[PDB]
Design a binder for this molecule. Structure first.
Ligand SMILES: CC(C)(CC(=O)C(=O)O)C(=O)O
Ligand SMILES: [Mn+2]
Lengths: 18, 428
Protein backbone atom coordinates (compact mmCIF):
# COMPACT_ATOMS: atom_id res chain seq x y z
CA UNK A 1 0.00 0.00 0.00
CA UNK A 2 0.79 3.66 -0.60
CA UNK A 3 -0.96 6.60 0.93
CA UNK A 4 -1.97 8.57 -2.11
CA UNK A 5 -5.19 10.47 -1.28
CA UNK A 6 -5.50 9.24 2.36
CA UNK A 7 -3.66 7.93 5.45
CA UNK A 8 -4.72 4.36 5.79
CA UNK A 9 -1.36 2.60 5.87
CA UNK A 10 0.36 2.16 9.21
CA UNK A 11 3.47 3.86 7.91
CA UNK A 12 3.30 5.84 4.66
CA UNK A 13 7.08 6.27 4.29
CA UNK A 14 9.45 3.32 4.37
CA UNK A 15 12.61 4.66 5.98
CA UNK A 16 15.63 2.40 5.63
CA UNK A 17 18.96 3.82 6.88
CA UNK A 18 20.14 7.15 8.07
CA UNK B 1 17.85 -5.68 35.87
CA UNK B 2 19.91 -8.93 35.70
CA UNK B 3 22.93 -8.15 33.54
CA UNK B 4 25.74 -10.37 34.90
CA UNK B 5 25.82 -14.15 34.89
CA UNK B 6 28.28 -15.08 37.68
CA UNK B 7 31.29 -15.32 35.43
CA UNK B 8 30.55 -11.66 34.53
CA UNK B 9 30.61 -10.72 38.19
CA UNK B 10 34.09 -12.23 38.43
CA UNK B 11 35.41 -9.80 35.77
CA UNK B 12 33.26 -6.82 36.67
CA UNK B 13 36.26 -4.59 37.35
CA UNK B 14 37.42 -4.64 33.70
CA UNK B 15 33.88 -4.37 32.35
CA UNK B 16 33.12 -1.28 34.47
CA UNK B 17 36.30 0.25 32.97
CA UNK B 18 35.39 -0.21 29.32
CA UNK B 19 31.89 1.14 29.84
CA UNK B 20 33.55 4.06 31.59
CA UNK B 21 35.24 5.06 28.35
CA UNK B 22 31.92 4.90 26.57
CA UNK B 23 29.69 6.93 28.93
CA UNK B 24 32.37 9.63 28.48
CA UNK B 25 32.06 9.69 24.70
CA UNK B 26 35.36 7.96 23.77
CA UNK B 27 33.43 5.49 21.65
CA UNK B 28 36.36 4.33 19.50
CA UNK B 29 38.40 3.66 22.65
CA UNK B 30 35.40 1.98 24.33
CA UNK B 31 34.70 -0.33 21.39
CA UNK B 32 38.29 -1.56 21.33
CA UNK B 33 38.32 -2.29 25.01
CA UNK B 34 35.19 -4.33 24.59
CA UNK B 35 36.67 -5.99 21.55
CA UNK B 36 39.59 -7.24 23.58
CA UNK B 37 37.47 -8.13 26.59
CA UNK B 38 35.39 -10.12 24.09
CA UNK B 39 38.35 -11.84 22.47
CA UNK B 40 39.51 -12.45 26.06
CA UNK B 41 36.21 -13.70 27.42
CA UNK B 42 34.50 -14.98 24.28
CA UNK B 43 31.78 -16.33 26.56
CA UNK B 44 31.16 -13.21 28.70
CA UNK B 45 27.65 -12.00 27.83
CA UNK B 46 28.16 -8.49 29.21
CA UNK B 47 31.43 -8.10 27.29
CA UNK B 48 29.56 -9.04 24.11
CA UNK B 49 26.63 -6.73 25.02
CA UNK B 50 29.30 -4.19 25.60
CA UNK B 51 30.76 -4.47 22.10
CA UNK B 52 27.24 -4.35 20.62
CA UNK B 53 26.24 -1.18 22.50
CA UNK B 54 29.36 0.74 21.62
CA UNK B 55 28.83 -0.52 18.03
CA UNK B 56 25.42 1.11 18.22
CA UNK B 57 26.76 4.44 19.52
CA UNK B 58 29.59 4.50 17.02
CA UNK B 59 26.98 3.97 14.34
CA UNK B 60 24.98 6.99 15.50
CA UNK B 61 27.97 9.36 15.41
CA UNK B 62 29.25 7.86 12.16
CA UNK B 63 25.63 7.94 10.92
CA UNK B 64 26.41 4.65 9.21
CA UNK B 65 24.16 1.73 8.32
CA UNK B 66 27.25 -0.53 8.18
CA UNK B 67 28.45 0.14 11.73
CA UNK B 68 24.88 -0.54 12.79
CA UNK B 69 24.57 -3.66 10.64
CA UNK B 70 27.61 -5.16 12.41
CA UNK B 71 26.14 -4.43 15.86
CA UNK B 72 22.95 -6.27 15.00
CA UNK B 73 25.06 -9.33 14.60
CA UNK B 74 26.74 -8.70 17.94
CA UNK B 75 23.39 -8.32 19.69
CA UNK B 76 22.46 -11.71 18.21
CA UNK B 77 25.78 -13.16 19.34
CA UNK B 78 25.04 -12.26 22.97
CA UNK B 79 21.93 -14.41 22.93
CA UNK B 80 23.66 -17.24 21.13
CA UNK B 81 25.97 -17.45 24.11
CA UNK B 82 25.54 -19.59 27.21
CA UNK B 83 24.30 -18.70 30.65
CA UNK B 84 22.84 -15.41 29.36
CA UNK B 85 20.56 -13.77 31.96
CA UNK B 86 17.04 -13.29 30.72
CA UNK B 87 17.13 -9.51 31.11
CA UNK B 88 20.19 -9.30 28.83
CA UNK B 89 18.56 -11.78 26.51
CA UNK B 90 15.40 -9.79 26.05
CA UNK B 91 17.07 -6.38 25.91
CA UNK B 92 19.75 -7.52 23.49
CA UNK B 93 17.22 -9.08 21.13
CA UNK B 94 14.64 -6.30 21.45
CA UNK B 95 17.44 -3.84 20.56
CA UNK B 96 18.20 -5.92 17.50
CA UNK B 97 14.67 -5.94 16.11
CA UNK B 98 14.03 -2.25 16.85
CA UNK B 99 17.19 -1.41 14.93
CA UNK B 100 16.53 -3.83 12.06
CA UNK B 101 13.26 -1.94 11.66
CA UNK B 102 15.17 1.36 11.57
CA UNK B 103 17.29 0.04 8.73
CA UNK B 104 14.06 -1.36 7.30
CA UNK B 105 14.85 -5.07 7.22
CA UNK B 106 11.43 -5.84 8.63
CA UNK B 107 11.45 -9.45 7.48
CA UNK B 108 14.51 -9.75 9.66
CA UNK B 109 13.01 -7.83 12.57
CA UNK B 110 9.92 -10.05 12.70
CA UNK B 111 11.99 -13.24 13.02
CA UNK B 112 13.91 -11.73 15.96
CA UNK B 113 10.49 -10.63 17.25
CA UNK B 114 9.03 -14.11 16.93
CA UNK B 115 12.15 -15.65 18.39
CA UNK B 116 11.33 -13.32 21.29
CA UNK B 117 7.75 -14.60 21.83
CA UNK B 118 8.92 -18.22 21.80
CA UNK B 119 11.54 -17.32 24.41
CA UNK B 120 9.04 -15.41 26.60
CA UNK B 121 5.48 -16.51 25.88
CA UNK B 122 4.19 -14.81 29.05
CA UNK B 123 5.26 -11.35 27.87
CA UNK B 124 2.26 -9.43 26.54
CA UNK B 125 4.51 -6.47 25.81
CA UNK B 126 6.54 -8.56 23.36
CA UNK B 127 3.45 -9.94 21.54
CA UNK B 128 2.40 -6.35 21.27
CA UNK B 129 5.72 -5.52 19.65
CA UNK B 130 5.42 -8.44 17.28
CA UNK B 131 2.00 -7.26 16.20
CA UNK B 132 3.78 -4.08 15.16
CA UNK B 133 6.33 -6.05 13.16
CA UNK B 134 3.42 -7.52 11.20
CA UNK B 135 1.77 -4.14 10.49
CA UNK B 136 5.03 -2.61 9.24
CA UNK B 137 5.19 -5.21 6.42
CA UNK B 138 1.42 -4.86 5.72
CA UNK B 139 0.53 -8.33 7.14
CA UNK B 140 -2.65 -7.21 8.78
CA UNK B 141 -4.21 -10.62 9.43
CA UNK B 142 -1.35 -11.87 11.55
CA UNK B 143 -1.25 -8.55 13.35
CA UNK B 144 -4.90 -9.09 14.16
CA UNK B 145 -4.20 -12.47 15.66
CA UNK B 146 -1.42 -11.21 17.97
CA UNK B 147 -3.63 -8.47 19.39
CA UNK B 148 -6.73 -10.64 19.78
CA UNK B 149 -4.56 -13.08 21.77
CA UNK B 150 -3.03 -10.28 23.87
CA UNK B 151 -6.48 -8.84 24.54
CA UNK B 152 -7.91 -12.21 25.44
CA UNK B 153 -5.48 -12.32 28.41
CA UNK B 154 -5.00 -8.62 29.25
CA UNK B 155 -8.27 -7.28 27.77
CA UNK B 156 -7.37 -3.70 28.64
CA UNK B 157 -3.91 -3.49 27.04
CA UNK B 158 -4.28 0.14 25.98
CA UNK B 159 -1.77 -0.50 23.19
CA UNK B 160 -3.33 -3.61 21.76
CA UNK B 161 -6.60 -1.72 21.62
CA UNK B 162 -5.53 1.26 19.42
CA UNK B 163 -3.75 -1.31 17.27
CA UNK B 164 -6.72 -3.62 17.23
CA UNK B 165 -8.95 -0.66 16.46
CA UNK B 166 -6.46 0.40 13.82
CA UNK B 167 -6.73 -2.99 12.13
CA UNK B 168 -10.51 -3.22 12.13
CA UNK B 169 -10.93 0.27 10.79
CA UNK B 170 -8.59 -0.76 8.00
CA UNK B 171 -11.02 -3.56 7.10
CA UNK B 172 -13.89 -1.06 7.05
CA UNK B 173 -15.26 -2.45 10.36
CA UNK B 174 -15.99 1.17 11.08
CA UNK B 175 -18.60 0.46 13.70
CA UNK B 176 -16.45 -1.86 15.74
CA UNK B 177 -13.13 0.04 15.58
CA UNK B 178 -14.53 3.05 17.44
CA UNK B 179 -14.72 1.63 21.01
CA UNK B 180 -11.20 0.18 20.67
CA UNK B 181 -9.70 3.40 19.35
CA UNK B 182 -11.56 5.49 21.94
CA UNK B 183 -10.81 3.21 24.94
CA UNK B 184 -7.28 2.54 23.73
CA UNK B 185 -6.66 6.31 23.56
CA UNK B 186 -8.07 7.23 26.93
CA UNK B 187 -6.02 4.48 28.51
CA UNK B 188 -2.89 6.55 28.30
CA UNK B 189 -0.82 3.33 28.24
CA UNK B 190 2.52 4.18 26.61
CA UNK B 191 1.97 4.05 22.85
CA UNK B 192 -1.61 5.21 22.69
CA UNK B 193 -0.88 8.88 22.02
CA UNK B 194 -0.19 8.67 18.30
CA UNK B 195 -1.93 10.97 15.90
CA UNK B 196 -2.62 7.97 13.71
CA UNK B 197 -5.36 6.66 16.07
CA UNK B 198 -6.66 10.17 16.63
CA UNK B 199 -6.93 10.63 12.80
CA UNK B 200 -8.64 7.26 12.34
CA UNK B 201 -11.11 7.40 15.25
CA UNK B 202 -12.51 10.78 14.26
CA UNK B 203 -12.80 9.57 10.69
CA UNK B 204 -14.66 6.42 11.81
CA UNK B 205 -17.10 8.42 13.87
CA UNK B 206 -17.64 10.75 10.89
CA UNK B 207 -18.53 7.84 8.56
CA UNK B 208 -21.17 6.63 11.04
CA UNK B 209 -22.54 10.09 11.81
CA UNK B 210 -21.24 10.50 15.40
CA UNK B 211 -21.11 14.28 16.03
CA UNK B 212 -18.47 13.70 18.77
CA UNK B 213 -15.82 13.21 16.05
CA UNK B 214 -14.72 16.86 16.22
CA UNK B 215 -14.36 16.88 19.96
CA UNK B 216 -11.52 14.44 19.27
CA UNK B 217 -9.99 16.50 16.47
CA UNK B 218 -9.74 19.48 18.88
CA UNK B 219 -8.07 17.07 21.29
CA UNK B 220 -5.61 15.56 18.85
CA UNK B 221 -4.69 19.10 17.94
CA UNK B 222 -4.42 20.09 21.57
CA UNK B 223 -2.12 17.12 22.21
CA UNK B 224 -0.35 18.54 19.16
CA UNK B 225 -0.76 15.79 16.49
CA UNK B 226 -2.86 17.83 14.08
CA UNK B 227 -2.07 21.30 12.78
CA UNK B 228 -5.75 22.10 13.29
CA UNK B 229 -9.09 20.31 13.53
CA UNK B 230 -9.46 20.93 9.80
CA UNK B 231 -5.81 20.14 8.82
CA UNK B 232 -4.79 16.71 10.05
CA UNK B 233 -2.07 15.48 7.66
CA UNK B 234 0.73 13.86 9.66
CA UNK B 235 3.74 13.80 7.24
CA UNK B 236 4.57 17.49 7.36
CA UNK B 237 7.13 20.22 7.56
CA UNK B 238 6.24 22.59 10.36
CA UNK B 239 6.17 26.07 8.85
CA UNK B 240 4.31 25.94 5.61
CA UNK B 241 1.51 28.36 4.72
CA UNK B 242 -1.80 26.67 5.49
CA UNK B 243 -5.05 27.56 3.76
CA UNK B 244 -7.64 25.21 2.16
CA UNK B 245 -7.88 27.27 -1.05
CA UNK B 246 -5.16 28.87 -3.21
CA UNK B 247 -5.06 31.02 -6.37
CA UNK B 248 -2.64 30.42 -9.26
CA UNK B 249 -0.85 33.66 -8.29
CA UNK B 250 -0.59 32.72 -4.58
CA UNK B 251 1.31 29.56 -5.51
CA UNK B 252 3.90 31.11 -7.84
CA UNK B 253 3.20 28.36 -10.41
CA UNK B 254 1.49 30.77 -12.76
CA UNK B 255 3.19 29.20 -15.74
CA UNK B 256 2.10 25.61 -15.07
CA UNK B 257 -1.48 26.72 -14.65
CA UNK B 258 -1.20 28.43 -18.01
CA UNK B 259 0.30 25.55 -19.99
CA UNK B 260 -2.63 23.56 -18.49
CA UNK B 261 -5.55 26.03 -18.95
CA UNK B 262 -4.54 26.72 -22.59
CA UNK B 263 -3.88 23.09 -23.56
CA UNK B 264 -6.97 21.68 -21.78
CA UNK B 265 -8.76 20.18 -24.79
CA UNK B 266 -5.72 18.01 -25.63
CA UNK B 267 -5.41 16.83 -22.05
CA UNK B 268 -9.10 15.98 -22.19
CA UNK B 269 -9.02 14.36 -25.61
CA UNK B 270 -6.16 12.09 -24.57
CA UNK B 271 -8.00 10.94 -21.47
CA UNK B 272 -11.30 10.53 -23.29
CA UNK B 273 -9.28 8.41 -25.73
CA UNK B 274 -7.98 6.19 -22.99
CA UNK B 275 -11.54 5.86 -21.69
CA UNK B 276 -12.80 4.80 -25.13
CA UNK B 277 -9.94 2.51 -26.08
CA UNK B 278 -7.73 1.67 -23.11
CA UNK B 279 -10.16 1.69 -20.17
CA UNK B 280 -7.90 -0.82 -18.39
CA UNK B 281 -5.42 1.93 -17.57
CA UNK B 282 -8.04 3.56 -15.33
CA UNK B 283 -8.00 1.82 -11.96
CA UNK B 284 -10.54 1.73 -9.14
CA UNK B 285 -9.80 3.83 -6.05
CA UNK B 286 -8.43 1.35 -3.52
CA UNK B 287 -7.95 3.51 -0.41
CA UNK B 288 -11.49 2.96 1.06
CA UNK B 289 -12.47 6.60 0.54
CA UNK B 290 -15.98 6.03 -0.99
CA UNK B 291 -19.26 5.68 0.72
CA UNK B 292 -20.72 4.75 -2.66
CA UNK B 293 -20.25 5.03 -6.38
CA UNK B 294 -17.65 4.65 -9.12
CA UNK B 295 -14.33 6.54 -9.18
CA UNK B 296 -11.35 5.20 -11.27
CA UNK B 297 -7.95 6.87 -11.92
CA UNK B 298 -5.30 6.93 -14.74
CA UNK B 299 -1.92 7.86 -13.23
CA UNK B 300 0.94 9.30 -15.28
CA UNK B 301 3.42 10.22 -12.47
CA UNK B 302 3.61 8.89 -8.92
CA UNK B 303 6.12 9.80 -6.21
CA UNK B 304 7.67 12.08 -8.78
CA UNK B 305 8.51 9.14 -11.08
CA UNK B 306 6.87 8.84 -14.51
CA UNK B 307 4.96 5.73 -15.63
CA UNK B 308 6.15 4.87 -19.09
CA UNK B 309 3.25 2.65 -20.13
CA UNK B 310 0.70 5.14 -18.87
CA UNK B 311 2.41 7.84 -20.89
CA UNK B 312 2.16 5.85 -24.12
CA UNK B 313 -1.57 6.51 -23.63
CA UNK B 314 -1.68 10.30 -23.05
CA UNK B 315 1.62 10.99 -24.77
CA UNK B 316 1.33 14.66 -25.75
CA UNK B 317 0.21 15.37 -22.18
CA UNK B 318 3.27 13.70 -20.66
CA UNK B 319 5.51 15.78 -23.01
CA UNK B 320 3.77 19.03 -22.09
CA UNK B 321 4.13 18.38 -18.38
CA UNK B 322 7.82 17.41 -18.53
CA UNK B 323 8.31 21.17 -18.73
CA UNK B 324 7.44 21.50 -15.02
CA UNK B 325 9.50 19.76 -12.32
CA UNK B 326 7.53 21.43 -9.56
CA UNK B 327 4.94 18.73 -10.31
CA UNK B 328 6.66 15.94 -12.26
CA UNK B 329 9.19 15.93 -9.39
CA UNK B 330 6.78 16.10 -6.45
CA UNK B 331 7.93 12.90 -4.78
CA UNK B 332 4.99 13.48 -2.39
CA UNK B 333 2.33 13.74 -5.10
CA UNK B 334 0.70 12.24 -8.20
CA UNK B 335 -0.46 13.41 -11.64
CA UNK B 336 -3.51 11.58 -12.90
CA UNK B 337 -6.87 11.69 -14.61
CA UNK B 338 -9.75 10.97 -12.22
CA UNK B 339 -13.11 9.94 -13.65
CA UNK B 340 -16.07 10.00 -11.24
CA UNK B 341 -19.57 8.79 -11.91
CA UNK B 342 -23.03 9.68 -10.60
CA UNK B 343 -24.10 8.23 -7.30
CA UNK B 344 -20.76 8.97 -5.72
CA UNK B 345 -20.00 10.49 -2.35
CA UNK B 346 -16.41 10.57 -1.13
CA UNK B 347 -16.13 10.50 2.59
CA UNK B 348 -14.49 13.46 4.34
CA UNK B 349 -10.82 12.68 4.38
CA UNK B 350 -7.24 14.10 4.43
CA UNK B 351 -4.14 13.43 2.43
CA UNK B 352 -1.00 12.32 4.24
CA UNK B 353 1.11 15.40 3.75
CA UNK B 354 1.05 19.18 3.90
CA UNK B 355 4.11 19.19 1.56
CA UNK B 356 1.93 19.37 -1.57
CA UNK B 357 -0.83 21.44 -3.14
CA UNK B 358 -3.31 19.90 -5.52
CA UNK B 359 -4.42 21.35 -8.87
CA UNK B 360 -7.63 20.23 -10.50
CA UNK B 361 -8.26 20.96 -14.17
CA UNK B 362 -11.82 20.81 -15.45
CA UNK B 363 -11.97 18.46 -18.39
CA UNK B 364 -15.54 17.10 -18.63
CA UNK B 365 -17.71 18.82 -15.97
CA UNK B 366 -21.47 18.20 -16.08
CA UNK B 367 -23.44 21.42 -15.64
CA UNK B 368 -24.99 20.37 -12.31
CA UNK B 369 -24.16 17.86 -9.57
CA UNK B 370 -20.44 17.99 -8.77
CA UNK B 371 -19.57 19.61 -5.45
CA UNK B 372 -16.24 19.50 -3.60
CA UNK B 373 -15.83 20.84 -0.08
CA UNK B 374 -12.48 21.64 1.51
CA UNK B 375 -13.12 22.74 5.12
CA UNK B 376 -15.65 25.59 5.33
CA UNK B 377 -15.93 26.48 1.64
CA UNK B 378 -17.61 24.58 -1.23
CA UNK B 379 -16.54 24.78 -4.84
CA UNK B 380 -17.23 23.30 -8.27
CA UNK B 381 -15.05 22.71 -11.38
CA UNK B 382 -15.11 24.49 -14.73
CA UNK B 383 -13.91 22.84 -17.93
CA UNK B 384 -10.65 24.30 -19.08
CA UNK B 385 -10.30 25.99 -15.66
CA UNK B 386 -8.00 25.01 -12.74
CA UNK B 387 -8.69 24.83 -8.98
CA UNK B 388 -6.00 24.51 -6.29
CA UNK B 389 -6.44 23.34 -2.72
CA UNK B 390 -4.42 22.07 0.21
CA UNK B 391 -5.42 18.39 0.28
CA UNK B 392 -3.85 18.12 3.76
CA UNK B 393 -7.16 19.80 4.73
CA UNK B 394 -10.48 18.01 5.05
CA UNK B 395 -12.22 17.57 1.66
CA UNK B 396 -15.39 15.77 0.63
CA UNK B 397 -16.99 15.26 -2.78
CA UNK B 398 -20.36 14.37 -4.34
CA UNK B 399 -21.16 13.40 -7.98
CA UNK B 400 -24.93 13.63 -8.43
CA UNK B 401 -25.12 14.52 -12.14
CA UNK B 402 -26.57 12.45 -14.95
CA UNK B 403 -23.24 11.66 -16.66
CA UNK B 404 -19.55 11.17 -16.03
CA UNK B 405 -17.19 13.84 -14.66
CA UNK B 406 -13.52 14.06 -15.54
CA UNK B 407 -10.68 16.24 -14.21
CA UNK B 408 -6.87 16.25 -14.29
CA UNK B 409 -5.01 16.23 -10.97
CA UNK B 410 -1.50 17.67 -10.78
CA UNK B 411 0.34 17.74 -7.44
CA UNK B 412 3.02 20.46 -6.89
CA UNK B 413 5.58 20.95 -4.08
CA UNK B 414 4.24 23.27 -1.46
CA UNK B 415 5.70 26.45 -2.93
CA UNK B 416 7.36 27.72 0.31
CA UNK B 417 9.43 24.43 0.16
CA UNK B 418 13.12 25.06 -0.70
CA UNK B 419 15.10 23.08 -3.28
CA UNK B 420 17.18 21.08 -0.79
CA UNK B 421 13.89 20.25 0.95
CA UNK B 422 12.53 18.70 -2.27
CA UNK B 423 15.73 16.70 -2.53
CA UNK B 424 15.54 15.44 1.08
CA UNK B 425 11.96 14.71 2.05
CA UNK B 426 10.88 11.06 2.13
CA UNK B 427 8.73 10.07 -0.82
CA UNK B 428 5.06 9.36 -0.10
C1 LIG C 1 -11.44 11.66 -6.42
C2 LIG C 1 -11.41 13.14 -6.29
C3 LIG C 1 -12.34 13.39 -5.10
C4 LIG C 1 -9.97 13.57 -6.06
C5 LIG C 1 -9.54 13.99 -4.61
O1 LIG C 1 -10.03 13.74 -3.49
C6 LIG C 1 -8.42 14.71 -4.54
O2 LIG C 1 -7.69 14.85 -5.49
O3 LIG C 1 -8.08 15.24 -3.38
C7 LIG C 1 -12.04 13.58 -7.59
O4 LIG C 1 -11.70 13.04 -8.80
O5 LIG C 1 -12.97 14.37 -7.56
MN1 LIG D 1 -8.49 13.67 -1.79
Amino acid sequence: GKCKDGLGEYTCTSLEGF
Amino acid sequence: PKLLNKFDKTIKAELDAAEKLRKRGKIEEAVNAFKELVRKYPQSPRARYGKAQCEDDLAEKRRSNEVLRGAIETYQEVASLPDVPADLLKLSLKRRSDRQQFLGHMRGSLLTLQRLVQLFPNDTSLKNDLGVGYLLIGDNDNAKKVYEEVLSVTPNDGFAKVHYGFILKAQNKIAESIPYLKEGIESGDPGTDDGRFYFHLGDAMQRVGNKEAYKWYELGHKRGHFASVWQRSLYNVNGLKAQPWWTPKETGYTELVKSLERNWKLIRDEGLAVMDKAKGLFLPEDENLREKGDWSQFTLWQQGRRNENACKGAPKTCTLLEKFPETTGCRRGQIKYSIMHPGTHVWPHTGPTNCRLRMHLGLVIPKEGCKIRCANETKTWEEGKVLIFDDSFEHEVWQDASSFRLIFIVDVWHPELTPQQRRSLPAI
